[PDB]
Each structure stands twice: as structure tokens, then as C-alpha cells.
Design a protein around this ligand. Structure first.
Ligand SMILES: [Mn+2]
Ligand SMILES: [Mn+2]
Lengths: 125, 125
């Protein structure tokens, strides 16, 4: 009804998106790899430019999981009934080159599943 | 283990906080009243100033649920092992004056429950 879970696995590691509908608004939690976390949080509505918070990681640098959160936002923006919040934290120990390139097709694959679920479950009752 | 739910009810309406631990990081979803939603999203760590996104509501104005999200952030900041994300959407149809004043004691009551749970479940294994 108001909660769904989507997974995908390419190049030997998994990514998961957990979606929650609250009122007309959406919360999506994206994780994967060996160490799930919350690295970045992207915020948007259907007719608003997305904003992203990047949390600090180590050595003065910031988490780069916003590649995932910002791409999923662009893919699903047109379908938003209200606000949308996307958290992302994907990390694979000793990640490989083929694994890095698979991050974008995996985000698209989850985005497509989310979009299908939204069309089958109109947030308007 | 990694998920807990806290409720409180004062002046005849309820507020709920759902907490999720991901890695070392926290996601807290606060709702209540007749129409739960996601109005505002506050982001912080233990030694960082909090930032808040205010989503648009109606008539060019913005949701004011950040009163709740920003107060819960201040209450629990010292206890944070990593990043923290707090969403808030509380709305009561024809809210009353006693109900408005109860918003702050209710947020404190949830914050105290969250803090107790974090101390009993150290995010470090
Ligand atoms: Mn990260
Ligand atoms: Mn609101």
C-alpha cells in the first residue's frame, strides 16, 4: 500500500531502494554494496530544482553517493505528487572498475521500478 | 536491532518517530496529527550546524514542520555517531491552541525516547 522495496544486482553487487509514501510525499532510501550508509540526501519536488546535502566522510572530503541520489531524482521528478527525499549510501570494499560503471545502470533500473510502482499506486487514494 | 518506533500523545493528538540505523548513520521520520506528510528535512552531524530544507506548501508559503525537526536535532545532536536526517510533517485539522503548545513537549518526549534507545543500542556493533 504505502511501502515498497526494489533491488538490483549487476557486476556482482547489489543496490536496494526502499520507498515510503507519506501523505502525498515520498521518502526513498538507497543503499548497497558491503557498507550501507547515508552519505548524501537529495530533496526535490516536481517543478523545483533539486538540492543535495553532502555529509562529511573522512580526511576533510565529502561522500559522493550524490551521484546516485541526484540521478534517481532526475529520473523520477516528473512523476512526483508532492515532496521527495532521497538518501544514498553505497560502498563496496575494493570496488572494481566494472562495478563503478554499473552504478548508473543500477540506479536507472531502480528508478524504473519505482516509476512503475507509482503508476500502479496513484498517491491520490 | 536497527529500527524502532516511538509514539506520544498529548492534548488529544499523537506524534510518531520512526528511527532507522544505517551503518553509523540515522534516519528519523516524524509524523502526526490527522495528515502525516514530509514538510521539512533537517540534516546534521554531531559537530556540524544543522541545515533545513523547507518544502513549499500552498499559496507561496512553506511548511513549518521544521519547528519539530530542528528541535529534535538540537536535543539529540551530542549522541550522533555519524550523519542524521530528520523529516517532519505534522498536521491536525482545526488545530487548537492547547494542541499547538503541546508540539514542543511532544518532540522532547520523542527525543528522550530516541536518546534512551541509542544508549541501549550503541551503533558500534
Ligand atoms: Mn559514501
Ligand atoms: Mn507541513
Amino acid at each position: 500500500h504505502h511501502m515498497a522495496t526494489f533491488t538490483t544486482e549487476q557486476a556482482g553487487y547489489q543496490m536496494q531502494a526502499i520507498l515510503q509514501v507519506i501523505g502525498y510525499d515520498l521518502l526513498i532510501v538507497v543503499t548497497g554494496g558491503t557498507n550501507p550508509h547515508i552519505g548524501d540526501v537529495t530533496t526535490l519536488t516536481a517543478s523545483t530544482v533539486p538540492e543535495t546535502v553532502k555529509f562529511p566522510s573522512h580526511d576533510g572530503r565529502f561522500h559522493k553517493d550524490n551521484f546516485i541520489s541526484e540521478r534517481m531524482a532526475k529520473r523520477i521528478q516528473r512523476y512526483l505528487a508532492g515532496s521527495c527525499t532521497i538518501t544514498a549510501g553505497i560502498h563496496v570494499n575494493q570496488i572494481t572498475k566494472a562495478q563503478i560503471a554499473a552504478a548508473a545502470p543500477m540506479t536507472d533500473d531502480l528508478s524504473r521500478q519505482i516509476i512503475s510502482w507509482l503508476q500502479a499506486h496513484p498517491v491520490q487514494a
